[PDB]
Amino acid sequence: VPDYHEDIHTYLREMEVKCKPKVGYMKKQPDITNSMRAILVDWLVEVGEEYKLQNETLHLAVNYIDRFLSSMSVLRGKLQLVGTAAMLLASKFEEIYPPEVAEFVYITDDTYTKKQVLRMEHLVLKVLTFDLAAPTVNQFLTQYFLHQQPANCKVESLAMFLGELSLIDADPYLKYLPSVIAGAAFHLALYTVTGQSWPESLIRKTGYTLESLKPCLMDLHQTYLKAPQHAQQSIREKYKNSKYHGVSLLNPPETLNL
């Protein structure tokens, strides 16, 4: 029951500020780049498909990674090890039964040992100070969906798609809180499917007017438009599945009417 929905929403809005990554961090990494991060994330999407992991598990892993890379320098050869330990941790946090560690070693094709992954897990825990219950775009979406009239499952699939697209590109997406990105994804998916718009229920609840969403929306629309050309294609291929009503086949709108 919706007894706690206001309370949880408010608390998630508090926590997302506290669980925010450093926006300008990739420029202080001497060895890694937005483009490598993009490859790592796209690979994590496939790992999650491979092991049938929940979508929340991927968003959590990417939040752990960005918070980690916010304070720890990492050589390109160790980036995938940070990614693997994050996905393991997120699976333990969020999955019913997470894959075994051996499975995580198997998925890098044995490029690290089980010990290395395990020690990296401990390091990730220490750096994150065991704070793993991070609000994600996927969580703000789920809450937002309660406000559909009526619920439309293409709208739901499509907003998830878009919210996942944003995990891939540090620039620009690390500028926005999950609640804002979720706001843009939801509007853009609604608009795409039906022509409808960020509903007034949510304007009041979130305090986000459609105008305030504008910068994030502009970016997300451009991402949506260019997705079929993007270097990384994992999320598109995922959201062609009938599970997802093939929403990632749908034609994006060429203008937003803003």
């Binding site: 790592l40 690979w43 390109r76 050869g77 980036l79 995938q80 890098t108 490029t111």
Partner: peptide
């Protein structure tokens, strides 16, 4: 293996 991701090669970067």
């Amino acid at each position: 293996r991701l090669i970067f």
